[PDB]
Design a protein around this ligand. Structure first.
Ligand SMILES: CCCCCCCCCCCCCCCCCC(=O)OC[C@H](COP(=O)([O-])OCC(O)COP(=O)([O-])OC[C@@H](COC(=O)CCCCCCCCCCCCCCCCC)OC(=O)CCCCCCCCCCCCCCCCC)OC(=O)CCCCCCCCCCCCCCCCC
Ligand SMILES: CCCCCCCCCCCCCCCCCC(=O)OC[C@H](COP(=O)([O-])OCC[N+](C)(C)C)OC(=O)CCCCCCCCCCCCCCCCC
Ligand SMILES: CCCCCCCCCCCCCCCCCC(=O)OC[C@H](COP(=O)([O-])OCC[N+](C)(C)C)OC(=O)CCCCCCCCCCCCCCCCC
Ligand SMILES: CCCCCCCCCCCCCCCCCC(=O)OC[C@H](COP(=O)(O)OCCN)OC(=O)CCCCCCCCCCCCCCCCC
Ligand SMILES: CCCCCCCCCCCCCCCCCC(=O)OC[C@H](COP(=O)(O)OCCN)OC(=O)CCCCCCCCCCCCCCCCC
Ligand SMILES: CCCCCCCCCCCCCCCCCC(=O)OC[C@H](COP(=O)(O)OCCN)OC(=O)CCCCCCCCCCCCCCCCC
Ligand SMILES: CCCCCCCCCCCCCCCCCC(=O)OC[C@H](COP(=O)(O)OCCN)OC(=O)CCCCCCCCCCCCCCCCC
Ligand SMILES: CCCCCCCCCCCCCCCCCC(=O)OC[C@H](COP(=O)(O)OCCN)OC(=O)CCCCCCCCCCCCCCCCC
Ligand SMILES: CCCCCCCCCCCCCCCCCC(=O)OC[C@H](COP(=O)(O)OCCN)OC(=O)CCCCCCCCCCCCCCCCC
Ligand SMILES: CCCCCCCCCCCC(=O)OC[C@H](COP(=O)(O)OCC[N+](C)(C)C)OC(=O)CCCCCCCCCCC
Ligand SMILES: CCCCCCCCCCCC(=O)OC[C@H](COP(=O)(O)OCC[N+](C)(C)C)OC(=O)CCCCCCCCCCC
Lengths: 347, 98, 175, 120, 115, 99, 171, 140
């Protein structure tokens, strides 16, 4: 692909998302998603192989269906309020369709089947956009319509996401499928605290993006896409295995690492609202996530898997990958708990 | 909510149920997406024309503009699916496992 | 009665949808969407929008003409399926019409029906406005404001159509 | 919960009313920790690219420390402003609704009866 | 009423002519008479087989440009506004971007039919 | 909006089409202009929590104008009663209601 | 809630102006020059009162003045006017362009026998001012009392008491 | 589901066991139909009757579990004259677990189901008495 065309298509993806965040009119919000899907698909088809074609097609079919439901919600909201403002919806049926449309876009359970497959079928760089940047626009809308969202619907999707994400990640050896099911589980935490304190939804999203972007950057550095491919990293870049250990432990929510902050703050807000059974269930179910992160540390950093002879040839060359912001991201993804009160800037 | 809104909203539901129940052809499902856009256009045009919401009269046109982009985008993917398997069957799109 | 022309057109509008929603050969599905587009133009045209009705019909006539060419190239088989050749297609076709019949039967008998929303069967004419406009078409004045009021809409749609051409070439390049 | 606060300063990093609050001291412990995180980023940058960790590129290490401290200073000003605003609203609301926050009648433990539970 | 009666008359006349065509003449139908025409020899395959479209890319582009006529046709009414400076700017901007799309596809060999 | 770039920059990107009582071409009014204006002015600056209960009268009239649910029910009863009387020969329609 | 108040059929009784649309369009320019004050009075009432029930009396003076306008044409300009509006009535669009010769004959009769000067181009579209003793409506929308605003929060902005007070944090 | 639950909780404990058994059997049966739908949708049956057979297998397992819970938890609260006692639900929950074992033809699943379904039923009853909220309305 022409480098200029890649840059233009990349900026169109951002423009679609930015239109959704600055739009106060529902029509412009819908235009943002349509522009975002129009530009994302060519980046999925970049390598032009059958798996990338299937991933793009499954992604297009799911996103297109969600945008239809979102437009139905907008029009129904128009019939019952006579205005297009991006605020609380004025009809229960409009809220359900918009909530479900935003759930399909996010890949929440039970609308999750595409996330594991689309991520596997596209390169690591495209997958990073799929699991970090594509979550900003739908989360922007949920942040503004949460007063009208049915509590049972949103909490049901959150609980199913935490369960399916944890279970699905146990039976996986592909890193892109592991990161895909991890993403679904984390969506549950963002939307579970949404009815109670939307600020903590932003905190978990920001921390999830930083940690997720760190993992893909380190997988991109070594061109590793499988557990066993990542198991050779200790024999090429020993430092990279320590950074993967610290980040994976952070993603598992273990203190004193950064990734414990979003769980800690989400439990606080839910317990203030006398929600005790759900935070306890969510925290315990999250141990499923920590298990298949621990399984990656074992085969990556804490043990030394068998190597191959040709690995000795890789010792004579440096890492030429850009690895942009990796030294900064890995630090922010591991040592930020002492700065937790800085979550107030998000308010 | 006149009796016309019933049929228009039923048309959307029929096209939605049609899109969620694939038979074999990817092209058959693409028609259901274009059918759903038609229902939304008609439903939006009716509400706007009936309430004399003058400035909203351009919204249905802007709704067709982005329906064509999606329709063209869906056709472009259908070309590449056909070039890889010789048909537009959706059962061939199963190399990626959940 | 001609007082129910809008309702009668909306019944055909649904029947056309059941035509392509049952998913026969896309050749016949394309025909169904043309019928719905034609009657959909009629329905919109009877609420005071002639440009909108004629425009959507115009856009979907060209839309299904490209789909027709793509059906003979990539969505064709030896025995294209009709609404009678397949039990799955026939089953979904008969089901759609039966639900349309029951909804039409109940609304015209009870003058009401409650499915998610509450619908009224008095006739679509009871909600029309009793005042006349001036020397212009309100729908035409609203659509013409896209260039004086909709500066932001023109830019995003204009950019979207531009990128749309760039994207389809990228997707179909194959190398 | 403070998204729609009456303060008509929308999409501003630091509203002008935030200039009434003391700035963070340059020796603030929170600002020192942020600066330390910059130093760790400098060392990790050297290690992933296989350079002498402590010595290589002192020019680049200083820019890591400065960049972190610079951004950290403004995030601390906004952090302290948001907490100052939180207390301002809380005290104003309590003043505007005295009936909801009455002064409880004071009692002494010589007057209040507390059940005694033997440990035997 | 007039338009509907005009349409009914045109398609009623068309239908009655077809009906006369099939019921007036003397018919002698047999298998060879109704076989498909392929210049005298039996067709080698089914006419329902795939037929490659070499102008598929131009056909997709027609969908995008056919939507510019919807955006451009309101121009005669748009010229009646009091905001002529804004209207003329966005009219030319919209047409120019339509032209840049044509230029991009033309230069990138997008309008050339596949071999 | 999540980020309010419009309000700070002073640029009106999409606010001009959000409500039907805003400025329209040639000052063409919407059918429910008065009802929308009243509901918007009643519920200005008081938040949706309060407006949901303190401006309930204006919002119910606004919804009545938009969808005409109560008017159509009232017309249905009158029309249904008239047929019952006529079906049992108990009411003669006047001339101006027939021709 | 409440009973819609309507005028009686006797309050709506008035002598109608039974002349076709071609008659009105032929005399429109002179009609708008002579009957301006009762016309503009009634048209101010509708836009201020926003209720047709509050402007019935003004609406009758529009009819009364229009009749007197045509009676004066019927006394002096009966024949030229008939030819003028017959020629406007012939066209499907009731165009003025096709009846200039007949318009001139109608314009000169009124000018001599009545002193009526045709308004120039743009005159009848002017926004004019009208003097009226009818009081300005105070609550034309019948609005209720607007809810009291939330108690505004104002004062000096002091530092957060003991910092963030987030669990164990001292700052 | 809100309708059935309100019907179940309106009947006082240990009374009208015929009605409470109807309520619980409805809840279990509905759960077995929701499982059958996804199973049929995601694991396509080889034939129509093979899929109707699967639907009847899951729907009967869930209906039997629901029926035995309400019956066993209602007579227990009737014999003991102790309505507001989680022990009644513990007995009912374990009985439902045993029925799951019989349908699965596994002693191990019978023991595990009895232990965890027994605890869950007891916890459900405690939450009804104390006022525990699973989906709590936002308050602060
Ligand atoms: C306004 C205030 C903004 C404060 C930040 C200013 C510095 C940022 C620009 C420096 C830069 O080029 O990095 C951008 C970025 C750095 O990415 P990188 O490749 O990972 O940097 C490491 C390289 O090895 C870098 O090594 P290099 O050899 O390739 O280049 C040396 C570089 C060295 O520059 C550096 O020091 C890199 C680190 C600076 C960026 C640190 C991230 C920003 C800090 C804020 C984030 C932390 C938040 C606070 C902590 C949490 C909350 C308290 O020095 C410069 O290039 C000078 C450029 C001057 C313009 O480069 C880009 O590609 C984007 C441009
Ligand atoms: C480019 C935008 C997309 C990338 C950012 C995606 C992050 C989304 C979630 C975190 C948003 C940051 C939290 C809000 C914030 O602090 O910034 C807005 C702050 C405060 O804005 P605010 O207090 O008015 O609230 C807006 C944001 N919400 C409602 C979500 C809190 O303002 C600015 O910093 C903009 C001024 C600088 C402009 C240059
Ligand atoms: C809000 C908090 C949320 C908490 C969430 C908690 C999630 C955990 C729930 C997991 C339940 C999974 C149950 C699986 C059952 C599988 C059974 C099976 O397949 O057969 C296995 C086996 C039969 O398999 P087998 O016949 O093939 O042989 C097994 C041996 N090997 C492996 C060699 C083949 O049967 C069992 O052993 C099951 C034991 C039944 C007894 C269970 C009692 C548990 C009671 C709780 C623990 C007691 C301590 C706590 C006391 C509390 C006092 C108040
Ligand atoms: C109320 C909504 C349901 C209405 C009934 C709709 C079913 C109509 C009958 C039907 O669709 O066909 C039955 C279908 C099997 O159809 P068939 O395509 O012939 O399968 C074998 C093909 N080799 O078998 C089915 O899947 C029917 C499922 C019901
Ligand atoms: C993880 C951490 C990632 C950090 C990434 C960097 C984000 C912080 C960047 C701060 C840079 C400060 C620049 C210097 C300040 C300045 O000079 O102003 C620049 C600009 C204008 O300021 P303004 O408030 O709009 O003007 C008001 C005038 N009356 O104001 C600005 O441009 C402000 C900077 C843009 C907004 C940055 C995002 C603000 C929200 C912080 C997100 C990070 C939250 C971290 C939460 C961690 C929880 C432990
Ligand atoms: C003893 C056996 C018990 C039978 C099951 C229990 C029935 C009672 C459950 C119930 O509460 O009723 C729910 C519903 C009836 O509908 P409802 O209007 O809610 O009635 C009031 C209910 N309180 O009745 C139900 O539908 C409950 C069962 C839910 C079935 C869900 C299965 C998925 C439905 C989609 C089918 C597959 C997709 C369809 C398209 C494919 C082609 C058909
Ligand atoms: C509609 C539900 C989904 C469905 O299609 O089920 C089909 C299933 C078996 O149909 P089958 O002929 O095997 O289809 C094979 C396609 N390659 O047949 C079935 O629908 C089984 C489930 C029937 C519904 C259960 C009874 C209620
Ligand atoms: C609404 C109700 C939906 C009913 C489901 C559709 C009818 C099913 C017809 C029977 C299908 C054949 C079948 O196997 O189901 C029989 C079922 C017991 O299942 P079973 O035969 O014992 O399977 C072996 C168990 N390991 O026996 C049954 O109980 C079938 C009926 C299920 C509903 C019972 C509700 C109480
Ligand atoms: C299989 C599905 C079918 C079986 C499950 C259905 C039966 C359980 C439903 C719960 C009962 C219920 O819905 O009613 C709420 C109950 C009290 O109800 P009520 O008395 O009417 O409240 C007003 C009091 N003034 O109050 C309660 O229910 C108390 C809740 C206690 C929950 C304890 C559960 C501990 C284990 C965690 C499971 C829940 C978290 C997992 C995610 C759940 C997702 C839905
Ligand atoms: C495949 C077909 C799907 C099902 C379509 C419905 C068929 C059954 C209709 C029975 C209802 C009924 O008894 O009503 C009959 C009405 C008649 O018209 P009306 O204007 O309501 O006159 C009746 C009211 N009067 C007396 C005030 C004038 O029929 C319809 O308007 C149906 C829509 C037209 C048919 C589609 C073309
Ligand atoms: C009409 C009103 C009826 C009222 C009935 C009252 C309730 C009684 C229900 C009985 C159901 C039944 O029959 O249980 C029977 C089943 C038996 O196992 P199975 O799978 O059938 O073995 C079939 C094996 N084959 C396939 C080879 C034939 O139990 C069980 O699995 C329990 C066995 C393990 C003991 C668990 C107790 C210890 C763990 C608990 C710790 C707290």
């Amino acid at each position: 692909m022409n480098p200029i065309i890649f840059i233009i298509i990349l900026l169109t993806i951002m423009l679609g998302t930015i239109i959704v965040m600055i739009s106060s009119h529902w029509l412009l919000v819908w235009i943002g998603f349509e522009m975002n899907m129009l530009a994302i698909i060519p980046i999925m088809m970049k390598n032009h192989n059958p798996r990338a074609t299937e991933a793009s097609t499954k992604y297009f079919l799911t996103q297109s269906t969600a945008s239809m439901l979102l437009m139905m919600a907008v029009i129904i909201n128009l019939m019952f309020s006579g205005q297009w403002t991006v605020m609380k919806l004025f009809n229960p049926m409009a809220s359900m369709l918009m909530t479900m449309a935003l759930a399909m876009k996010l890949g929440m359970a039970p609308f999750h089947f595409w996330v594991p497959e689309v991520t596997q079928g596209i390169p690591l760089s495209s997958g990073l956009i799929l699991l970090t940047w594509q979550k900003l626009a739908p989360m922007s809308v949920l942040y503004q319509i949460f007063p009208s969202i049915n509590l049972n619907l949103i909490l049901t999707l959150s609980v199913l996401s935490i369960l399916i994400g944890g279970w699905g990640g146990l039976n996986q050896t592909q890193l892109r499928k592991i990161m895909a099911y991890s993403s679904i589980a984390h969506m549950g935490w963002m939307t579970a605290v949404l009815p109670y304190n939307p600020t903590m939804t932003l905190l978990n999203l920001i921390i999830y993006i930083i940690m997720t972007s760190t993992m893909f950057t380190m997988f991109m550095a070594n061109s590793t896409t499988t557990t066993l491919s990542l198991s050779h990293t200790w024999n090429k870049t020993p430092i990279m295995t320590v950074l993967i250990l610290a980040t994976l432990l952070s993603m598992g929510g273990l203190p004193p690492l950064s990734g414990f902050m979003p769980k800690w703050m989400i439990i606080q807000e839910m317990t203030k609202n006398n929600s005790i059974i759900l935070p306890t269930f969510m925290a315990i179910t999250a141990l499923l996530n920590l298990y298949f992160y621990m399984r990656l540390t074992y085969s990556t950093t804490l043990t030394m898997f068998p190597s191959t002879n040709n690995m000795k040839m890789k010792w004579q060359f440096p890492l030429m990958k850009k690895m942009t912001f990796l030294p900064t991201m890995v630090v922010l993804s591991t040592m930020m708990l002492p700065l937790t009160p800085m979550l107030s800037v998000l308010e | 909510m006149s009796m016309v809104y019933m049929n228009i909203m039923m048309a959307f539901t029929v096209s939605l149920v049609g899109l969620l129940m694939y038979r074999s052809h990817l092209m058959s499902s693409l028609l259901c997406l274009e059918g759903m856009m038609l229902s939304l256009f008609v439903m939006a045009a009716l509400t706007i024309l009936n309430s004399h919401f003058t400035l909203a009269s351009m919204m249905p046109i802007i709704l067709l503009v982005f329906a064509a982009c999606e329709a063209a985008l869906g056709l472009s993917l259908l070309v590449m699916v056909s070039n890889t398997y010789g048909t537009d069957y959706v059962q061939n799109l199963n190399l990626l496992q959940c | 009665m001609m007082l129910y022309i809008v309702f009668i057109l909306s019944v055909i509008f649904v029947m056309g949808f059941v035509g392509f929603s049952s998913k026969p050969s896309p050749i016949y599905g394309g025909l169904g969407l043309i019928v719905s587009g034609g009657v959909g133009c009629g329905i919109v045209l009877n609420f005071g929008g002639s440009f909108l009705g004629l425009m959507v019909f115009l856009i979907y006539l060209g839309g299904m003409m490209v789909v027709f060419g793509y059906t003979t190239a990539m969505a064709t088989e030896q025995y294209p399926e009709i609404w009678l050749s397949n039990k799955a297609v026939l089953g979904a076709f008969v089901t759609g019409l039966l639900m349309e019949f029951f909804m039409v039967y109940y609304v015209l008998k009870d003058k009401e029906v409650e499915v998610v929303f509450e619908f009224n069967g008095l006739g679509d004419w009871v909600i029309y406005d009793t005042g006349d406009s001036g020397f212009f078409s309100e729908e035409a004045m609203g659509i013409a404001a896209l260039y004086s009021y909709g500066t932001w809409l023109v830019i995003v749609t204009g950019w979207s159509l531009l990128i749309g051409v760039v994207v389809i070439m990228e997707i179909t390049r194959g190398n | 919960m403070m998204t729609g606060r009456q303060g008509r300063a929308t999409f501003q990093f630091l509203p002008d009313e935030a200039r009434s609050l003391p700035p963070p001291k340059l020796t603030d412990p929170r600002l020192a920790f942020v600066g330390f995180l910059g130093y760790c980023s400098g060392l990790i940058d050297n290690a992933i690219r296989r350079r002498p960790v402590l010595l290589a590129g002192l020019h680049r290490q200083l820019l890591y420390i400065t960049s972190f401290v610079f951004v950290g200073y403004y995030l601390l000003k906004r952090q302290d402003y948001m907490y100052a605003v939180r207390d301002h609203d809380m005290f104003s609301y309590i003043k505007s609704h005295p009936e909801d926050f009455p002064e409880k009648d004071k009692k002494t433990y010589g007057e209040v009866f507390e059940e005694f539970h033997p440990v035997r | 009423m007039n338009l509907m009666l005009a349409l009914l008359t045109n398609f009623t006349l068309a239908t009655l002519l077809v009906i006369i065509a099939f019921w007036l003449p003397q018919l002698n139908v047999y298998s060879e008479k109704t076989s498909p025409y392929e210049c005298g020899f039996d067709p080698m395959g089914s006419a329902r087989l795939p037929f490659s479209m070499k102008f598929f890319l131009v056909a997709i582009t027609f969908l995008l440009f056919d939507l510019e006529i919807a955006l451009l046709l309101p121009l005669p009414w748009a010229s009646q506004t009091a905001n002529l400076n804004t209207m003329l700017t966005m009219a030319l901007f919209l047409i120019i971007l339509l032209a840049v799309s044509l230029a991009y596809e033309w230069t990138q060999k997008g309008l050339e039919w596949t071999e | 909006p999540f980020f309010d770039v419009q309000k700070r920059l002073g640029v009106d990107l999409d606010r001009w089409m959000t409500i039907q009582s805003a400025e329209q071409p040639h000052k063409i009014p919407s059918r429910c202009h008065a009802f929308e204006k009243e509901w918007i002015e009643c519920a200005h600056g008081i938040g949706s929590i309060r407006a949901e209960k303190e401006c309930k009268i204006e919002f119910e009239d606004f919804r009545e104008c938009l969808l005409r649910q109560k008017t159509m029910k009232r017309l249905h009863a009158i029309r249904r009663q008239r047929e019952k009387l006529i079906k049992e020969g108990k009411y003669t329609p006047p001339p101006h209601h027939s021709g | 809630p409440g009973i819609v108040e309507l005028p009686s059929l006797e309050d709506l009784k008035v002598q109608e102006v039974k002349v076709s649309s071609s008659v009105l369009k032929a005399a429109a320019h002179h009609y708008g020059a002579q009957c301006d004050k009762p016309n503009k009075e009634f048209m101010l009432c509708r836009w201020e009162e926003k209720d047709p029930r509050r402007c019935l009396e003004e609406g009758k003076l529009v009819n009364q003045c229009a009749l007197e306008f045509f009676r004066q044409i019927k006394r002096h300009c009966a024949e030229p006017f008939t030819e003028y509006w017959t020629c406007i009535d012939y066209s499907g669009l009731q165009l003025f362009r096709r009846c200039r010769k007949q318009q001139a004959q109608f314009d000169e009769c009124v000018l001599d026998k009545l002193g009526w000067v045709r308004p120039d181009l743009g005159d009848l579209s002017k926004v004019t001012k009208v003097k009226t003793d009818r009081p300005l409506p105070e609550n034309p929308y019948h609005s209720r009392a607007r809810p009291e605003p939330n108690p505004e929060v104002e004062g000096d902005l002091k530092p957060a008491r003991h910092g963030s007070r987030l669990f164990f944090w001292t700052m | 589901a809100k309708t059935v639950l309100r019907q179940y909780w309106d009947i006082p404990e240990g009374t009208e066991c015929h009605r409470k058994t109807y309520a619980t059997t409805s809840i279990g049966g509905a759960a077995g139909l929701v499982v059958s739908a996804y199973s049929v949708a995601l694991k396509t049956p080889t034939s129509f009757l093979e899929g109707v057979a699967r639907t009847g297998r899951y729907t009967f397992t869930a209906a039997a579990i629901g029926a035995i819970f309400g019956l066993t938890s209602c007579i227990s609260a009737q014999v003991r004259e102790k309505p507001d006692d989680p022990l009644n639900y513990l007995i009912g929950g374990c009985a439902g677990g045993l029925i799951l074992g019989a349908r699965t033809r596994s002693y191990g699943i019978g023991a595990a189901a009895c232990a965890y379904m027994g605890l869950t039923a007891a916890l459900v009853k405690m939450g009804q008495l104390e006022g525990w909220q699973v989906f709590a309305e936002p308050k602060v």
